């Protein structure tokens, strides 16, 4: 069985869903953690300096 | 004449001799069974506390904190490093244990502000310090001429920004001349080379 097309047919699991806190479809319903805003992981909002150029 | 306080002071110049020695041997047994941060009704070293700003008044709190002894607790490098940045065992942290203790205490009492702290001994595996914290929101303090200064907004979380006596010393701010070229006015403004 190929890792490509044939293996894509098995994908019918729902993981990332609309987040209650930020509105992005990034709330992982199995982990109950938003990969975009951090909801479920931290009270503080998910942020990182690498999301932009170092001097900007 | 000598103050009664000077006697507590003098006892503590040699915590390993005299009655103080026996008191510590007894006490530490209880301390070792207490938590990380224990509020206490009265300072173990009155002379030191009053000397640091302590007052028997509403809004003044004292808490003893214990911390694990030794150097740093670091995880070895998973990614490549040159011999220099491979060090793991003998590398110590930049904040002394007293400072770590002041912060834990302040985290326990989110609403209070650290005023000062002092050592109350240690055993072979941990160190104890008592911390004086103040309630900036209590009127008994807002009206105190000697402590109301700690009520200002810029004094919030002072311990976490190194504004404590222990903080200032640890930042190499003791000396006003030679040796403080890279510490004053801040470690950061001097590129972190102090």
């Amino acid at each position: 069985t190929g890792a490509g097309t044939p293996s894509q047919g098995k994908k019918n699991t729902t993981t990332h869903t609309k987040c209650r806190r930020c509105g992005e479809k990034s709330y992982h319903t199995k982990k109950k953690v938003c990969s975009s805003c951090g909801f479920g992981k931290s009270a503080k909002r998910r942020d990182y300096e690498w999301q932009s150029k170092a001097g900007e | 004449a000598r103050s009664a306080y000077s006697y507590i002071r003098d006892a503590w110049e040699n915590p390993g001799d005299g009655q103080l020695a026996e008191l510590q041997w007894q006490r530490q047994q209880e301390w070792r069974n207490e938590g990380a941060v224990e509020r206490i009704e009265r300072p173990t070293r009155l002379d030191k506390a009053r000397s640091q700003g302590y007052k028997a008044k509403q809004g003044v709190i004292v808490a003893r904190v214990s911390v694990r002894k030794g150097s740093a607790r670091k995880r070895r490098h998973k990614a490549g490093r040159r011999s220099k940045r491979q060090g793991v065992t003998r590398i110590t942290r930049r904040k002394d244990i007293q400072r770590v203790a002041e912060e834990r205490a302040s985290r326990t009492f989110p609403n209070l502000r650290v005023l000062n702290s002092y050592s109350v001994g240690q055993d072979g595996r941990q160190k104890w310090h008592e911390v004086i914290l103040i309630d900036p929101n209590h009127p008994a303090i807002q009206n105190d001429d000697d402590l109301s200064w700690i009520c200002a907004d810029d004094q919030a979380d002072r311990v976490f920004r190194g504004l404590t006596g222990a903080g200032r010393r640890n930042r190499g701010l003791s000396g006003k001349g030679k040796g403080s070229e890279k510490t004053r006015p801040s470690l950061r403004s001097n590129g972190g080379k102090a």
């Binding site: - | 040159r82 011999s83 220099k84 940045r85 491979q86 060090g87 590398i91």
Partner: protein
Amino acid sequence: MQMPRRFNTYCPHCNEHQEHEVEKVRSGRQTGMKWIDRQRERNSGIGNDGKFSKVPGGDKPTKKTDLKYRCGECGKAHLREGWRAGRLEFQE
């Protein structure tokens, strides 16, 4: 090669020819207080220590004479260029 223990030659101090006694230069003991000693301690720590991690070099097949020439009358010694010599034995 053989070498006379004593002989007449020029003493740069008396400024005239006098009898000298020849001796092989014996190594003096270190004190461990020179600037280099302090730099070794100061700069050696965790990991590689640069120059202080290097170790003793090799050896030339033959070494040059390492001698002291002592004036027999003013008691002072002077040094001279050496010359490669497999062995140096003094006569008397």
